[PDB]
Amino acid sequence: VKPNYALKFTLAGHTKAVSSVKFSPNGEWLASSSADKLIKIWGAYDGKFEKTISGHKLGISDVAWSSDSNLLVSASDDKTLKIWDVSSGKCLKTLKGHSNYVFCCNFNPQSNLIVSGSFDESVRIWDVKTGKCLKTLPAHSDPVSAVHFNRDGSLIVSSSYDGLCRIWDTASGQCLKTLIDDDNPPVSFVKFSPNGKYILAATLDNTLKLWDYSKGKCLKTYTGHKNEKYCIFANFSVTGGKWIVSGSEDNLVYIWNLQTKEIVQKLQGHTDVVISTACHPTENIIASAALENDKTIKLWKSDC
């Protein structure tokens, strides 16, 4: 079986490179962040523009939804994160503490904590309610490219241009595991699988890898795309067939069969690097976003 993603909508509005796209967990919305300092909200099924959320002083590298789709957190070059009430557009808290650009962010499943990664080489854990920095982890020796909580929020996985993937105990801040595969290319993205058993990691040597983190073993490799320069997001698509989805520096969206590792579809249309992709939580819909020469987001739909 192979999917049949087809272009449905193109979303224009950002004035600079788009950096990250994410669907709300309730499937109603798409949030996008950009180097233009703005967050934009769009309808997930029709691509209709909803509103702009402003307040950061410099460009934004990431945005993430809370579990209940009520809040967003954004990470900016202004060295802050901001927690937003999506329905009102209000900035509830500004998270100050990183000493350099904030690159990545996520809520935990309970949505009471935020994790962030920065050019200052640290991973920070923040209290959502008070906006206070609870813990600072001296995590890496180069910028932190991604941070993500596991299924119950007990662990954090982080990646960095230093070539490492690390697993941290949320409660103690202890480094439980360092994962690396015999070459040291920058690790440009990492996330836990929906079931929490695996970690999907991207490296700047044109490779995605699926790790069993309990065993510290690489189980699957996905190749064929171009990724040597940018921190491109990758996803598990689970609504229909089980795929791995990623953007690429050759301007395409790549889709692989998770089990066989074969490329099953390539989505053509963007005119610059596809930096971010997201998979809709219930429908076979992919959102893709591109860099400065393109500035658009595309919504693609498949029958499987």
Partner: peptide
């Protein structure tokens, strides 16, 4: 700008 939209060299 935004750091994700830039190249970072070790």
């Amino acid at each position: 700008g935004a750091a994700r939209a830039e190249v970072y060299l070790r």
